Amino acid sequence: NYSAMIFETIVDGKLKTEKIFKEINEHSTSYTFRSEKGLLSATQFTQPALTLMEKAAFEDLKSK
Amino acid sequence: SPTLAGMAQRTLKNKYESYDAALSLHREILCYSKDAKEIYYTPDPS
User: Fold this and answer.
1) CB-CB contact of B20 with B12 (8 Å)
2) End-to-end CA distance of chain A
3) Are B40 and A57 within 8 A, CB to CB?
4) Chain A residues near any Cβ of chain B (below 8 Å)
5) Measured between CB atoms, does B40 come within 8 Å of chain A?
6) How big is the CA angle at A57 (ends A52 and A58), to the nearest 5 degrees?
7) CB atoms within 10 A of CB A49
8) Shortest alpha-carbon distance between residue A61 and chain B (Å)
9) Alpha carbons A6 and A21: distance in angstroms, whole number
10) Which of A5, A18, A27, A43 is the most exposed place for a label (fewest CB within 10 A)?
11) Does B36 touch chain A if contact means CB atoms closer than 8 Å?
12) What is the DSSP string of A8-61?
């Protein structure tokens, strides 16, 4: 599920279907997320949390 | 945080002075985090 992630950046010539997490292969055992302060402010964590909080808030109001 | 509340609040301050009064239109600006009691309708006894 980490492998199959893709993106497309312009690299000097043309488009490129390069994958995220170049380290992760079929022989990888660990991957590590590194921050300076905390993972909460690294935007692949910020974004879902923010989204959840708001949806959660809404469903409470919908229940009421 | 009330980011968009502020953005809405100050947009009405700028160019909706003449328009809101013209319709007798009362406006209510609410954030979830701050203005919980008005949205949940659960004020204190007071």
Assistant:
1) yes
2) 37
3) no
4) 54, 57, 61, 64
5) yes
6) 100
7) 10
8) 7
9) 9
10) A27
11) no
12) ----SSS---PBS-SS--TT--------SS-GGGSSTTHHHHHHHHHHHHHHHH
Q: How far is B17 from chain A (nearest CA, A)?
A: 31
Give resolution in angstroms: 4.6
Please report, as a single letter, which amino acid is at residue A62: K
Q: CA-CA distance, B11 to A57, in Å (whole number)?
A: 26
Burial class from Cβ neighbours inside 10 Å (0-12, 13-18, 19+) for residue A56 reads exposed
B32 touching A, CB under 8 A?
yes
What's the CA gap between A20 and A2, in Å, rounded?
A: 8
Burial A3-25 (b: 16+ CB within 10 A, else e): eeeeeeeeeeeeeeeeeeeeeee
Euclidean distance between CA atoms B8 and B3, whole angstroms: 9
